[PDB]
Amino acid sequence: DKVYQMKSKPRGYCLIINNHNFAKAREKVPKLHSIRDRNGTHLDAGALTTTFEELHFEIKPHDDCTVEQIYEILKIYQLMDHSNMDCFICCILSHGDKGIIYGTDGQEAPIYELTSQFTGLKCPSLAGKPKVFFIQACQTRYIPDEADFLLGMATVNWYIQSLCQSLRERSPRGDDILTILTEVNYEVSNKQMPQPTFTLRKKLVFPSD
Amino acid sequence: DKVYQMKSKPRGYCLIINNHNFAKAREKVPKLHSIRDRNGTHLDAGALTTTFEELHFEIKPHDDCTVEQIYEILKIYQLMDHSNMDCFICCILSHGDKGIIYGTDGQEAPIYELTSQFTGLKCPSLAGKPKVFFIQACQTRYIPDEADFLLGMATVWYIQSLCQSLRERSPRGDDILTILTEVNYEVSNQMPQPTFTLRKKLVFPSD
Numbered sequence: 001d002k003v004y005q006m007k008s009k010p011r012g013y014c015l016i017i018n019n020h021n022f023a024k025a026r027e028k029v030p031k032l033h034s035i036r037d038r039n040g041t042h043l044d045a046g047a048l049t050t051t052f053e054e055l056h057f058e059i060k061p062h063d064d065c066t067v068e069q070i071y072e073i074l075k076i077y078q079l080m081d082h083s084n085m086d087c088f089i090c091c092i093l094s095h096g097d098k099g100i101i102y103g104t105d106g107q108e109a110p111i112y113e114l115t116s117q118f119t120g121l122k123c124p125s126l127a128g129k130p131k132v133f134f135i136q137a138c139q140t141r142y143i144p145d146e147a148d149f150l151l152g153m154a155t156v157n158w159y160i161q162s163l164c165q166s167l168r169e170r171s172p173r174g175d176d177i178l179t180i181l182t183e184v185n186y187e188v189s190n191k192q193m194p195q196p197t198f199t200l201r202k203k204l205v206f207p208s209d
Numbered sequence: 210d211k212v213y214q215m216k217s218k219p220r221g222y223c224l225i226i227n228n229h230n231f232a233k234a235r236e237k238v239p240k241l242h243s244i245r246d247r248n249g250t251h252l253d254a255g256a257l258t259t260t261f262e263e264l265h266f267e268i269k270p271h272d273d274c275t276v277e278q279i280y281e282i283l284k285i286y287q288l289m290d291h292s293n294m295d296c297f298i299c300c301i302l303s304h305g306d307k308g309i310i311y312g313t314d315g316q317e318a319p320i321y322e323l324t325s326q327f328t329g330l331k332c333p334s335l336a337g338k339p340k341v342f343f344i345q346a347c348q349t350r351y352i353p354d355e356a357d358f359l360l361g362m363a364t365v366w367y368i369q370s371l372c373q374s375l376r377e378r379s380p381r382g383d384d385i386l387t388i389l390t391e392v393n394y395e396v397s398n399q400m401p402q403p404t405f406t407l408r409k410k411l412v413f414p415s416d
């Protein structure tokens with residue numbers, strides 16, 4: 001029973017990346033000649049703003065991002081001085097694939113190339129602090145070989161909905177994020193299942209009290 | 210707040226593949242010309258048996274297994290009728306590339322191709338009940354999209370702290386993730402990566 005240093009104001013930045021218009025994708029990329037536009041994402045996005053502002057993160061959201069657009073966004077936060085922070089969360093809501101994420105231009109960012117941005121050897125002020133990634137797909141490893149990491153990855157063809165509901169619910173009760181994820185795993189299987197993989201050293205909780 | 214039904218005598222099978230004599234690997238596979246014999250792996254193995262025999266698991270140890278020996282041992286328990294069991298554990302001590310494992314003949318086996326044997330479809334006798342995998346290989350997907358899996362794997366200590374923190378805590382009723390998060394700090398100061406798709410909590414009562 002060790003718990004991460006959740007308590008601060010604010011606790012961290014909650015990156016929300018929220019791609020929707022894959023128009024240039026439908027144009028510039030052949031194999032994605034007919035890729036639907038991920039409308040309805042705002043319900044996921046709005047909930048992600050809702051739950052995580054309540055848990056004392058300052059949401060910094062971006063909509064419709066290229067891979068280049070996605071990539072430069074994270075350097076802003078890799079190079080940022082996180083010393084005053086306690087945690088770091090990044091949500092990505094886009095079309096998915098096996099181990100990669102699609103930008104609105106139809107190009108690809110591997111899940112390992114995004115997570116690996118925030119190491120200790122790359123983001124030192126955010127060392128020993130938990131670094132969380134929630135991703136929801138649609139239709140090598142995924143994490144640096146380092147501690148203090150969580151990847152809530154899923155693949156659609158509602159995950160973010162139930163994840164929010166269990167966060168709003170369980171967090172003021174003092175349940176940890178792993179407890180929440182098992183509850184989220186059950187809350188969808190009745191099987192495009194999410195596979196949480198992590199390297200976190202200690203318990204991670206988002207206290208509302 | 211659910212917990213996997215673990216009350217069962219025996220709780221389940223607990224495979225312990227234990228590769229040590231990689232002579233045949235050196236003997237035939239040239240890039241594994243000087244692949245070291247895994248000396249000391251006979252210390253992890255005993256800890257695992259001791260840990261899980263206390264946890265009411267019928268240990269099934271297997272030493273120095275090649276690739277088809279492995280594909281055939283999993284084949285047995287894949288076709289088995291675990292209807293009176295409440296859990297399935299498979300330990301693998303060996304070494305390989307980032308995604309494969311090396312049999313004692315240097316032949317490969319993707320870890321997915323192992324965890325993928327105990328599906329619901331491929332092992333209906335094991336539906337809705339935890340299929341746990343521990344892997345310690347010294348230096349794509351890893352588990353199928355079905356529920357009730359755990360993959361405590363370490364690219365490479367891990368198994369000795371996994372055991373010590375398992376006999377120490379499983380009596381107290383703590384969840385597996387609580388345990389796995391603890392062995393992370395012990396290993397922290399290379400890193401294991403537990404991917405898991407479990408629906409309820411998971412404890413091993415000690416009675």
Ligand SMILES: *CC(=O)N(c1ccccc1)[C@@H]1CCCN(C(=O)c2ccc(N3CCOCC3)cc2)C1
Nearest residue numbers: 247248249250251252253304345346347365366367
């Ligand atoms: C890959 C491997 O074989 N490891 C390992 C290395 C790094 C991290 C985790 C695991 C082995 C696993 C077993 C123990 N070990 C040793 O180096 C070792 C070997 C022999 C001993 N002796 C000899 C007889 O038994 C008692 C003491 C001690 C340690 C790491």
